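Hello everyone,

My group is preparing for a crystallization screen and wants a predicted model to guide construct design. The compound we'll soak is MJE. Before spending weeks at the bench, it would help to have a computed complex in hand. I've included the protein sequence and the ligand's SMILES below. Output in structure-token form would be ideal because that's what our pipeline reads.
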Amino acid sequence: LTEIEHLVQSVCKSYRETCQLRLEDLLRQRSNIFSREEVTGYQRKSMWEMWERCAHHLTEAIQYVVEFAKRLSGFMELCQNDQIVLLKAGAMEVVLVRMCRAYNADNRTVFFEGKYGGMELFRALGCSELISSIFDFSHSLSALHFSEDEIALYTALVLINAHRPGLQEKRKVEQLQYNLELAFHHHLHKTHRQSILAKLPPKGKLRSLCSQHVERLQIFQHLHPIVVQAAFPPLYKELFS
Ligand SMILES: C[C@H](CCCC(C)(C)O)[C@H]1CC[C@H]2[C@@H]3CC=C4C[C@@H](O)CC[C@]4(C)[C@H]3CC[C@]12C
Ligand SMILES: Cc1cc2c(s1)c(-c1ccc(C(=O)O)cc1)nn2C(=O)c1c(Cl)cccc1Cl
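Reply:
Good plan to model first. Here are the tokens for the complex, ready for your pipeline.
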């Protein structure tokens, strides 16, 4: 078949092997919600304990996105500088997109440590405005009801972005980007789902939310640092250290 139909296939496979939580599991557990008492239990934890828990979960989620990127056709062929630039700009944007699969718009809950809970679970972090923004962004995306294949192709394009500042081989990121844009557009046409294009988040909004998120993470890491066994050291070193 066409290069483009094979690329649709390699991206969707990459996503399925690295999606971290299975959509069917997430959907099934929606009814499994934290009680008043369990919520109070989380709210009473120190900011230090809640940070340790949340940092760990976020680091693990980033590591699935790194593995996703490393399985995208052409990514490993980029110079290591460009692999770092794309993942440093993009990997947390992909996590915030992946969150919509684990988010229930009906009751504004997210799947966290085995059950669904609202943003007030995270009270002890003293991050309410930022956490509210992250929930609202997921609330936005949920209205699309992304298919597994749409989120695979969309999140590939979140990463493979030739406009990221600092790319050494910009022409080669463009070639990859053009093919992934064609794959996504082709797939939406084949599935009668072009309607989602007008509804995708403004790009500026994903960038500024995620930029705020990573700045807060870097402040917490500076105050109370957790240590990570880095899946991709060169990238980590430009984030931890
Ligand atoms: C919004 C809250 C709190 C963020 C706190 C802050 C601002 C200090 O980072 C975070 C904490 C843990 C996060 C989840 C961790 C892992 C996953 C799985 C991945 O497949 C999709 C995203 C998700 C559900 C994260 C969402 C954001 C969460 C709840
Ligand atoms: C754009 C990116 C943001 C971001 C990335 S990438 C990573 C990360 C993680 C692991 C690896 C690896 O190689 O295993 C590499 C990179 N952490 N991280 C954070 O914001 C972060 C998190 Cl999630 C938790 C605690 C502290 C911090 Cl600072």
